[PDB]
Each structure stands twice: as C-alpha cells, then as structure tokens.
C-alpha cells in the first residue's frame, strides 16, 4: 500500500465534444450551466475563446465530476 500520490483514482475523461446550439449570430451569450447548476458566466459577443475552470462545482480528487 501507499498514499494517494500513487493509487487507483476515480477516472477522468479526456475527450471533448461539439454542440450545435441554434441558428443565427446572437448579440451575446451570457451563461453556461451543467446539471442544473450555474457553472460559468460571461458575455461572449463574437467568435472568441474562453476556458471553464471551476471544476469545484462538482468535485475532483475528493468528489465526482467537475467541468474544466
């Protein structure tokens, strides 16, 4: 046996996805939710890039889930 630095863990998934929301450029996209929980907020007004980083919303090395 050994401490959690080298042990079996709850397993991450590694692959992303692609979602078709709806037609037509919109003035701004505000907020993104996961599982009926307010995950990320921000006004996107055009072709751009961001990162969702609050994996704490569901868990991690001590709990399940968490988008990132």
């Amino acid at each position: 046996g050994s401490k959690s630095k080298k042990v079996t863990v709850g397993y991450k998934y590694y692959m992303g996805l692609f979602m078709g929301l709806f037609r037509g450029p919109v003035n701004e996209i505000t907020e993104i939710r996961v599982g009926d929980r307010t995950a990320w907020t921000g006004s996107i007004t055009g072709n751009t890039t961001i990162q969702i980083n609050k994996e704490s919303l569901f868990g991690g090395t001590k709990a399940e889930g968490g988008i990132d």
């Binding site: 078709g20 929301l21 709806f22 037609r23 037509g24 919109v26 003035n27 505000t30 907020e31 939710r33």
Partner: protein, 39 residues
C-alpha cells in the same frame, strides 16, 4: 386576446384538450428568441 376576436364566430370559453407540440421542451435557455434548429 386575438383568440377572443377569433371566437367572434361563437354561439355566445372552457376547453379540454392536449397540445400539438410547440417550442417548449427545454435544453437551452433563451432570454430572447434566436429561433432554433429542429434536428
């Protein structure tokens, strides 16, 4: 109320019916109508 004017042909408003599907079933919040696809 244009329903009220539509029923101007009546013989005088209770109703009992099921629905023909509309754009209610939710998977993307819309604070404004951007329309949507249909798949």
């Amino acid at each position: 109320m244009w329903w009220a004017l539509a029923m101007l042909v009546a013989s005088v408003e209770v109703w009992t019916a099921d629905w023909q599907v509309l754009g209610f079933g939710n998977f993307r919040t819309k604070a404004v109508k951007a329309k949507q696809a249909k798949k």
